[PDB]
């Protein structure tokens, strides 16, 4: 339609929903030759309110190729270059915007900032250069006789580049940071955390898109080999943290290519995606070459699969539409299916036991990303080609045994990820004789793989029973094995369709033996016990043994993110965290939760949580929500990494698990110290979910905890207050603040709006003559049965009456002010009396007419009664105003 979309974007700006407006103007630019500058200007304003300053600068630079006399592009680019640290060109843009519109007050405020910033710019740059020179000679250029002081220099550079955009500019040092890091990575005799902290510094530095594309194209004048070096940096070392940090570097490369960020909820710009499309296809080709390269190790391959998972799918904030289609139609899907056919016992390229779930989540996300029925059909055609290619080589020879193994691995990875495609492949009647052949074999690995295939088949739907009718007794045969690798895989399935007491004892027997039984055994034991744990008797049975909980925690810390679904299902059922029997009672729920938290459930949760499964992270979020119910435990939950984990869960879980993670954060920070519980930049990113908890219409218990946590967060710094105002929270808080039969919600809303008055924009909106906010600030000071509302509103009345226009509006707009004032002057609570007399006193110091109105009123007798006996000094100050006038 190409024309109503900017109208919808303008309506989204007027609704103050700026990410929707950014997406709409990005959509409207895609349907275009003189309507483009309006789109770039309004999209620059939308990105500027979005804290996207690079994109605002880009859209203003593109909007000036049409008319260089454009005051909007100049002003918005001055703001964007201000927030990026380039104050000189910001000054020049704002100077040209001032000489083309000399009466705009916003440009005057911008010039008032930028002249003071340009007078001190050179000293700030040379001081920052001296700081990074000190820390960078002590970190990279070899002035250190100890490892931990080089570590301290690296942590200082990391905090400095995370503090400001100018800090990242100074640490970048026009591109000397990446030789200083690469000639440290290639030193194999250097410490792990040194290298990982250096790469964390580099990842923060590349968050800029221009520096990151510069970083991509600089290692070799041949483009694809520079791309290959950047993508193969993870193969330089075998440590997990190194591979994770290098994967974050490649994530930065993707985020600079498409101009996307899933952490910032930033859908990509297709103009800058098509602009450097060649770099995107080069990185995708190099990573899918890394999927099947046997010189690439296991965790590097898992990281590449996670990069495809996060980045390629356009339905999950990734690389836009047409790229995953190309990935399926070409040889990338077949590479994922070939990695799906792998086990550590039989692999062609290195594959760990965790690789299967990474492939399964990536394949499920890709099957979801094929949105139309034809592309889903092409997906099914390629998996049928791979299925038929495997099953045509399943001969009865020794060679065909490994193809039977590959076929079974393929189908298990199907049934753990894209479940319905797997169920469609199970209903082949050529498939179940292969299972009956490998189950009746002498090879124990084939017996185990048949057992885990037929437990992968057990779901709710009944058309899989076509195999399960022969699968369940065969499984009951395999439980009679004297091999534990077959016995636990047959114990799953027995636990999954259901005797139960006998099973639970068998799962406990496998799980308690920690040294002699490996994590491969205890994983399937934990999976079977997760299947059993829906019954509350076995819940109380698990909780009543402490050493079983210790064994589950040891399995979590040693197996890592391999037992996420199982342990998270255990923790969710034991905590009764699923929303809705004599033993699912809140005393018993509290007993189970306290026992879990007492023996390390939260470090187990943070140990298993390094996956991209939205469902398993939803389970972890529900577990942490049920953990954070109890007020004496939540400090230990904060101390055991719970706040950072829930801040990850509110970004990367399922859509209904984000809500549970946010309610968990609200519980954790309701009655806690926000400097300890949310230290530093964390207190920024906690503002985003908690405002989304504010539902005055739904009216749950999450609203009070969210108001208390935002009240605590609004007391630490002004940036928190501005971001609370930025997230459209003020009407949501005012809806609680207007409630009549809800005392404590109104009190918490008054406390939060009291702490938000120290932010000057909300202070100026409260004084402003549009609203009746001052009326409620005055009348809630005299609404006297609730001490806390009166204290908060009297404090706000004391603060808001050091503006004389607010004093005049309180006088002429609020009728029955003398009753309110004589009540808060005689007031029973000391804090309310003190702040109310402070407000009355600076009303009288504000004007002579208003002081003459007060002295000739009902308020004067109680003022002179207070002065003739802390709050007496404020009434004395008001009588000093009366003596002055």
**Backbone φ, ψ for residue 371 (5° rounding):** -40, -30
For residues 359 and 336, what is the distance between their CA atoms, to the nearest angstrom?
7
For residues 343 and 197, what is the distance between their CA atoms, to the nearest angstrom?
33
For residues 342 and 332, what is the distance between their CA atoms, to the nearest angstrom?
16
Angle between helices 298-311 and 355-368 (to 10 degrees): 20
The Cβ-side half-sphere exposure at 462, using a 13 Å CA radius, reads 0
CA-closest candidate to residue 344, choices 38, 174, 562 = 562
**DSSP 8-state code for residue 413:** H
| Residue 559 burial by Cβ neighbours in a 10 Å radius (0-12, 13-18, 19+) | buried
Contact present, 257 and 213 (Cβ < 8 Å)? yes
| Residue 515 burial by Cβ neighbours in a 10 Å radius (0-12, 13-18, 19+) | exposed
CA-closest candidate to residue 246, choices 258, 228, 230 = 230
Q: Which residue has the tokens 């298993």?
A: 608
How many whole angstroms from its chain centre is CA 113? 33
Burial 267-282 (b: 16+ CB within 10 A, else e): bbbbebbeebeebbeb
Q: Which residues contact 60 (CB under 8 A, 6 or more apart)?
A: 40, 41, 44, 73, 74, 76, 77, 80
Start-to-end CA span in the chain (Å): 68
CA-closest candidate to residue 39, choices 17, 58, 15 = 58
Angle between helices 817-825 and 859-867 (to 10 degrees): 20
Contact present, 306 and 354 (Cβ < 8 Å)? no
Q: Where are the alpha helices (DSSP H) in 217-276?
A: 223-231, 240-257, 270-275
Which residues face 249 on adjacent strands? none
Experimental method: X-ray
Contact present, 453 and 411 (Cβ < 8 Å)? yes
For residues 428 and 728, what is the distance between their CA atoms, to the nearest angstrom?
54
Which helix (H) or strand (E) covers residue 516, if one does? none
Angle between helices 859-867 and 830-846 (to 10 degrees): 110
Contact present, 523 and 566 (Cβ < 8 Å)? yes
> 330 is written with which tokens?
């070409």
Which residues face 261 on adjacent strands? 266
How many whole angstroms from its chain centre is CA 808? 46
Which helix (H) or strand (E) covers residue 773, if one does? helix 773-782
Q: Which residues contact 28 (CB under 8 A, 6 or more apart)?
A: 2, 5, 6, 9, 39
> 843 is written with which tokens?
């009303």
Give CA angle at 218 (216, 219), nearest 5°: 95
CA-closest candidate to residue 775, choices 751, 803, 796, 802 = 796
Q: Which residues contact 663 (CB under 8 A, 6 or more apart)?
A: 625, 693, 702, 705, 706
Contact present, 55 and 259 (Cβ < 8 Å)? yes
For residues 405 and 415, what is the distance between their CA atoms, to the nearest angstrom?
15
Give the SS3 label for residue 343.
strand
Q: Where are the alpha helices (DSSP H) in 369-458?
A: 373-391, 398-416, 419-426, 431-439, 444-456
Which residues face 343 on adjacent strands? 346
For residues 235 and 250, what is the distance between their CA atoms, to the nearest angstrom?
13
Contact present, 759 and 722 (Cβ < 8 Å)? yes
Q: Which residue has the tokens 């980045």?
A: 311
Contact present, 851 and 842 (Cβ < 8 Å)? no
Other CB atoms within a 10 A radius of the CB of residue 718 amount to 11
Q: Which residues contact 299 (CB under 8 A, 6 or more apart)?
A: 238, 240, 243, 352
How many whole angstroms from its chain centre is CA 610? 13
> 375 is written with which tokens?
């592309």
Rg (CA), the chain: 32
List of domains in the chain? 3-117 (1.25.40.10), 118-486 (1.25.10.10), 487-884 (1.25.10.10)
| Cα separation values, 537 from 500, 541, 589, Å | 10, 6, 12
Contact present, 517 and 487 (Cβ < 8 Å)? no
> 44 is written with which tokens?
């620059």
Given its phi and psi angles, is residue 635 left (phi above 0), alpha (psi -120 to 50 degrees) or beta?
alpha
Torsion angle of the four alpha carbons 141, 146, 149, 151, in this order, in degrees rounded to the nearest 10: 80
For residues 405 and 401, what is the distance between their CA atoms, to the nearest angstrom?
6
Give CA angle at 125 (124, 128), nearest 5°: 85
Torsion angle of the four alpha carbons 45, 48, 52, 53, in this order, in degrees rounded to the nearest 10: 110
For residues 342 and 355, what is the distance between their CA atoms, to the nearest angstrom?
9
Contact present, 730 and 691 (Cβ < 8 Å)? no
Contact present, 534 and 495 (Cβ < 8 Å)? no
> 668 is written with which tokens?
């954790």
Which helix (H) or strand (E) covers residue 545, if one does? none
How many whole angstroms from its chain centre is CA 158? 21
Which residues face 266 on adjacent strands? 261
| Cα separation values, 190 from 154, 300, 621, Å | 14, 20, 38
> 152 is written with which tokens?
């301290």
Torsion angle of the four alpha carbons 128, 132, 133, 139, in this order, in degrees rounded to the nearest 10: 170
Task: Give the length of the chain.
Answer: 885
CA-closest candidate to residue 276, choices 246, 256, 250 = 256
Angle between helices 398-416 and 431-439 (to 10 degrees): 120
> 512 is written with which tokens?
């308690």
For residues 513 and 749, what is the distance between their CA atoms, to the nearest angstrom?
53
CA-closest candidate to residue 542, choices 611, 599, 622 = 599
Handedness of CA 64, 68, 71, 76 (dihedral sign): positive
For residues 65 and 46, what is the distance between their CA atoms, to the nearest angstrom?
20
Q: Which residues contact 304 (CB under 8 A, 6 or more apart)?
A: 247, 287, 290, 291, 296
Q: Where are the alpha helices (DSSP H) in 479-585?
A: 484-497, 500-512, 519-532, 536-543, 546-559, 564-574
Q: Which residues contact 32 (CB under 8 A, 6 or more apart)?
A: 2, 39
Contact present, 95 and 78 (Cβ < 8 Å)? no
Give the SS3 label for residue 610.
coil
Q: Which residue has the tokens 């706040």?
A: 643
For residues 409 and 727, what is the distance between their CA atoms, to the nearest angstrom?
47
């Amino acid at each position: 339609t190409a024309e109503e979309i900017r109208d919808e974007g303008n309506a989204a700006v007027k609704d103050q929903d700026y990410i929707k407006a950014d997406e709409l103007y990005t959509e409207a630019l895609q349907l275009t030759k003189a309507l483009r500058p309006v789109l770039y200007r309004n999209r620059a304003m939308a990105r500027l309110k979005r804290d996207d300053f690079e994109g605002a600068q880009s859209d203003c630079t593109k909007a000036l190729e049409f008319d260089g006399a454009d005051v909007k592009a100049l002003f918005r680019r001055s703001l964007a270059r201000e927030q990026l640290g380039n104050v000189g060109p910001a000054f020049q843009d704002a100077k040209e915007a001032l000489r083309l519109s000399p009466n705009d007050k916003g440009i005057v405020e911008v010039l008032q900032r930028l002249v003071k910033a340009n007078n001190d710019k050179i000293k700030q740059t040379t001081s920052l250069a001296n700081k990074v020179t000190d820390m960078e000679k002590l970190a990279f250029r070899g002035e250190a006789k100890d490892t931990e002081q080089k570590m301290t220099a690296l942590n200082n550079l990391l905090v400095l580049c995370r503090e400001s955009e100018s800090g990242a500019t100074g640490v970048w040092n026009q591109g000397a940071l990446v030789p200083f890091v690469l000639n440290l990575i290639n030193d194999a005799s250097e410490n792990e955390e040194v290298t990982v902290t250096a790469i964390r510094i580099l990842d923060e530095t590349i968050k800029n898109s221009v520096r990151c594309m510069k970083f991509l194209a600089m290692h070799d004048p041949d483009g694809p080999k520079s791309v290959r070096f950047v993508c193969r940096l993870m193969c330089k070392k075998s440590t997990k943290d190194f591979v994770d940090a290098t994967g974050i570097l490649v994530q930065r490369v993707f985020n600079a290519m498409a101009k996307m960020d899933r952490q910032k909820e930033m859908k990509p710009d297709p103009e800058v995606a098509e602009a450097n499309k060649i770099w995107i296809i080069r990185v995708l080709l190099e990573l899918q070459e890394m999927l099947q390269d046997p010189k690439v190790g296991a965790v590097q391959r898992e990281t590449c699969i996670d990069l495809f998972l996060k980045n390629l799918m356009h339905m999950d904030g990734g690389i836009p539409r047409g790229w995953s289609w190309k990935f399926v139609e070409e040889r990338g899907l077949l590479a994922l299916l070939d990695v799906a056919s792998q086990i550590p016992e039989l692999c062609e390229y290195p594959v760990s036991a965790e690789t299967r779930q990474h492939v399964a989540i990536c394949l499920q996300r890709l099957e979801e990303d094929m949105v139309f029925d034809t592309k889903r059909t092409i997906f099914k055609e390629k998996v049928d080609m791979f299925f038929n290619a495997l099953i045509s080589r399943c001969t009865n020879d020794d060679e065909g045994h490994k193809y039977r193994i590959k076929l079974s691995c393929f189908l298990i990875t199907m049934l753990q990820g894209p479940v319905d495609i797997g169920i469609n492949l199970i209903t082949n009647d050529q498939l179940t004789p292969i299972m009956l052949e490998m189950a009746a074999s002498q090879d124990h690995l084939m017996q185990g793989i048949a057992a885990e295939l037929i437990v992968a088949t057990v779901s709710k739907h009944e058309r899989a029973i076509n195999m399960l009718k022969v699968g369940i007794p065969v499984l009951r045969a395999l439980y009679d094995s004297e091999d534990p690798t077959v016995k636990v895989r047959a114990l799953v399935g027995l636990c999954k369709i259901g005797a139960v007491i006998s099973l639970a004892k068998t799962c406990k027997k496998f799980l308690l033996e920690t040294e002699k039984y490996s994590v491969d055994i205890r994983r399937y034991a934990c999976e079977g016990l997760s299947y059993l744990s829906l019954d509350a008797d076995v819940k109380e049975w698990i909780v009543d043994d402490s050493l079983l909980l210790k064994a589950l925690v040891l399995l979590a810390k040693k197996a890592g993110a391999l037992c996420v679904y199982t342990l998270a299902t255990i923790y969710a059922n034991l905590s009764n965290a699923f929303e809705k029997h004599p033993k699912d009672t809140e005393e018993y729920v509290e007993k189970r939760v306290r026992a879990l938290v007492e023996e390390g459930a939260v470090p187990a949760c943070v140990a298993v949580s390094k996956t991209e499964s939205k469902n398993a992270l939803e389970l972890i979020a529900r577990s942490l929500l049920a953990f954070a119910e109890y007020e004496d435990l939540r400090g230990r939950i904060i101390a055991e990494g719970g706040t950072v984990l829930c801040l990850r869960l509110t970004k990367e879980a399922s859509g209904e698990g984000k809500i549970k993670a946010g309610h968990a954060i609200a519980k954790l920070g309701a009655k806690a110290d926000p400097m300890i519980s949310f230290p530093g930049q964390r207190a920024y990113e906690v503002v985003k979910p908690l405002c989304d908890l504010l539902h005055p219409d739904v009216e749950g218990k999450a609203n009070y905890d969210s108001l208390l946590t935002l009240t605590n967060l609004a007391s630490v710094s002004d940036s928190i207050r501005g971001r609370i105002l930025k997230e459209k929270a003020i009407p949501k808080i005012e809806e609680f603040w207007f409630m009549t039969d809800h005392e404590h919600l109104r009190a918490a809303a008054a406390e939060l709006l009291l702490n938000l008055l120290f932010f000057e924009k909300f202070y100026e909106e409260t004084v402003a003559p549009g609203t009746d906010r001052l009326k409620f600030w005055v009348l809630y000071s005299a609404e006297v049965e609730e001490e806390r509302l009166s204290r908060a509103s009297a404090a706000g009345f004391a603060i808001l009456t050091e503006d004389e226009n607010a004093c005049a509006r309180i006088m002429d707009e609020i009728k029955s002010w003398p009753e309110v004032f004589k009540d808060i002057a005689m007031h029973e609570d000391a804090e309310t009396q003190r702040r109310g007399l402070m407000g009355i006193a600076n009303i009288m110091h504000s004007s002579n007419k208003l002081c003459s109105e007060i002295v000739s009123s009902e308020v004067f007798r109680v003022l002179v009664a207070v002065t003739k006996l802390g709050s007496t000094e404020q009434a004395k100050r008001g009588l000093e105003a009366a003596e002055k006038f």
